[PDB]
């Protein structure tokens, strides 16, 4: 019972262990293979088709989603023909609970350092997904 | 604390009937609360 | 020069022979001045770096400019304390290093209005209050208990009588307990030369209560000069600020209930007699609570009798070692 | 708090109460078991309080 107490006291409104399954299910249908990088225009229809429990409730919170896509660092620096799941789901799970970058707006490096020191041994797999 | 002061201001008030029966009550109350009475009962 | 070394040696020998002699009297200060950095002291290296809010104890006689004193600190050695006239002179010296101190400002006005210093530029003026740098206080600090509510009522009387008893017993043979039945809040020093000097004047204050209250002031002084610690069982003072501007400068002890919810039921524990006065018995609690903690000297903020009892015992033991 | 206040009254000498409360503040610290139920209850309390405050 206590091995599963996190799931048994769910209060399912900010759930994260389950919405990732829906994210994978949605991504699989649109993706025939990884092939490294995928297009851009799919992510908008994916957010529209994303589960309303996480990402958008009404028409107004979509603006907040735009506030998460714009007004910060851009993955557009590299080729626009690039995946965004490494930077979209991470951003949404970071901002849904325990948001810290918005109140500061300049202390991104300290948050990145905290993430790196908490992922110290991952064989440097996420460093390429943080971008 | 208040009881301690009541038993302190009663010894200094008698040191200088219905009063002699009250130091007996104070001694009883000091006796029903000691560890000896607790262990005996 | 041989004269300065000779007077240094004589002062050192006087200090050595006066190390084991009774203390004469004590002074109270209101200015943060250091007696070690002043070059006019008879002996250098043996000054006092005392801040404000401090007591000094003078024993022997030196001159009109300096005195031999000691601090109330533990381990504080014998030092030299400036005389009140010397402190007035050094206060005048404090405000002379500035560019200007009188009426002629230096706002690009040089050589136009010389303005020689009149009597307003000296210490002769500003005599509306003119607080002396030194105040006369009892040698040993009297101890006054305040709280948790109005005195003369059952709850406060018991909560103070228990501690009084503890002080009589534990410190028996070295502490004298005196009760101030009359008022004590009318201790003034800058009102008049002698208001009501004689009882035959038939004046308003001659027949008033000011006479006995003023005569009770130096009784505390007489108790203090015997080195025996004394307390004050004043039934009128219920707030530290009521007895803070006077010449007593006493130690104030705060016995307080943690919350008024406990205090109300504690008052209820006495009987129907105290329910009549329960109302007035509560504002006297929160008025004294709203007083800043810094006003009180010590705080007894706990409920256990024995631990709070030790809280005062160790503090007074530290005080006893401080002045010995 | 009481031990920290102890040093405040004694301004005439260097107080040792701070050292006494320091040496007696970490020895008993190793008794904070903080079981899974208590940790989950604390997290739930934090989340509920945040939701109530933010409405």
From Swiss-Prot, chain A:
Tissues showing expression? Isoform Alpha-1b-1 and isoform Alpha-1b-2 are expressed in the central nervous system, but not in skeletal muscle or aorta. Expressed in the cerebral white matter, cortex, hippocampus, basal ganglia, and cerebellum.
Q: Give me the disulphide-bonded residues.
A: none
Q: Where is the signal peptide?
A: none
Regarding how it is modified after translation, the entry says: Phosphorylated in vitro by CaM-kinase II, PKA, PKC and CGPK.
Residue ranges of every copy of the EF-hand domain listed in the record: 18-53
Superkingdom of the source species: Eukaryota
Q: Could you tell me what this protein does?
A: Voltage-sensitive calcium channels (VSCC) mediate the entry of calcium ions into excitable cells and are also involved in a variety of calcium-dependent processes, including muscle contraction, hormone or neurotransmitter release, gene expression, cell motility, cell division and cell death. This alpha-1B subunit gives rise to N-type calcium currents. N-type calcium channels belong to the 'high-voltage activated' (HVA) group. They are involved in pain signaling. Calcium channels containing alpha-1B subunit may play a role in directed migration of immature neurons.
Instruction: Write out the domain note.
Output: Each of the four internal repeats contains five hydrophobic transmembrane segments (S1, S2, S3, S5, S6) and one positively charged transmembrane segment (S4). S4 segments probably represent the voltage-sensor and are characterized by a series of positively charged amino acids at every third position.
Name of the protein:
Voltage-dependent N-type calcium channel subunit alpha-1B
Q: Which residues of the full protein are shown?
A: 1707 to 1837 of 2339
Swiss-Prot record, chain B:
Compartments (UniProt record): Membrane
| Tissue expression as described in the entry | Isoform Alpha-1b-1 and isoform Alpha-1b-2 are expressed in the central nervous system, but not in skeletal muscle or aorta. Expressed in the cerebral white matter, cortex, hippocampus, basal ganglia, and cerebellum.
Processing and modification events after translation: Phosphorylated in vitro by CaM-kinase II, PKA, PKC and CGPK.
Q: Where does this protein have coiled-coil stretches?
A: none
Q: State its role.
A: Voltage-sensitive calcium channels (VSCC) mediate the entry of calcium ions into excitable cells and are also involved in a variety of calcium-dependent processes, including muscle contraction, hormone or neurotransmitter release, gene expression, cell motility, cell division and cell death. This alpha-1B subunit gives rise to N-type calcium currents. N-type calcium channels belong to the 'high-voltage activated' (HVA) group. They are involved in pain signaling. Calcium channels containing alpha-1B subunit may play a role in directed migration of immature neurons.
Entry comment, domain topic:
Each of the four internal repeats contains five hydrophobic transmembrane segments (S1, S2, S3, S5, S6) and one positively charged transmembrane segment (S4). S4 segments probably represent the voltage-sensor and are characterized by a series of positively charged amino acids at every third position.
The family line of this record is: Belongs to the calcium channel alpha-1 subunit (TC 1.A.1.11) family. CACNA1B subfamily.
Swiss-Prot record, chain C:
Report the residues modified as Phosphoserine. Answer: 115
What keywords tag this UniProt record? Calcium, Calcium channel, Calcium transport, Cytoplasm, Ion channel, Ion transport, Phosphoprotein, SH3 domain, Transport, Voltage-gated channel
- Phosphoprotein: is it a keyword of this entry? yes
Enumerate the spans annotated as SH3 domain.
Answer: 22-91
Indicate where this protein resides in the cell: Cytoplasm
Q: What are this entry's molecular-function GO terms?
A: calcium channel regulator activity; high voltage-gated calcium channel activity; voltage-gated calcium channel activity
Q: Got a GO cellular component term for this one? A: cytosol
The transmembrane segments are none
Any idea what this protein is called? Voltage-dependent L-type calcium channel subunit beta-3
Native source species: Homo sapiens
Q: Which gene encodes it?
A: CACNB3
UniProtKB/Swiss-Prot annotation, chain D:
Protein name, as recorded = Voltage-dependent N-type calcium channel subunit alpha-1B
State the domain notes.
Answer: Each of the four internal repeats contains five hydrophobic transmembrane segments (S1, S2, S3, S5, S6) and one positively charged transmembrane segment (S4). S4 segments probably represent the voltage-sensor and are characterized by a series of positively charged amino acids at every third position.
Where is it located?
A: Membrane
Q: What disease is recorded for this protein?
A: Neurodevelopmental disorder with seizures and non-epileptic hyperkinetic movements: An autosomal recessive, complex and progressive neurologic disorder characterized by severe neurodevelopmental delay and developmental regression, epileptic encephalopathy, postnatal microcephaly, hypotonia, and non-epileptic hyperkinetic movement disorder, including myoclonus dystonia, choreoathetosis, or generalized dyskinesia. Disease onset in infancy or first years of life.
Which tissue types show expression of this protein?
Isoform Alpha-1b-1 and isoform Alpha-1b-2 are expressed in the central nervous system, but not in skeletal muscle or aorta. Expressed in the cerebral white matter, cortex, hippocampus, basal ganglia, and cerebellum.
User: Which protein family is named in the record?
Assistant: Belongs to the calcium channel alpha-1 subunit (TC 1.A.1.11) family. CACNA1B subfamily.
In this UniProt entry, the residues modified to Phosphoserine are 14, 17, 52
Describe its PTM? Phosphorylated in vitro by CaM-kinase II, PKA, PKC and CGPK.
Part of the whole protein covered: 732 to 786 of 2339
Q: Give me the gene this protein comes from.
A: CACNA1B
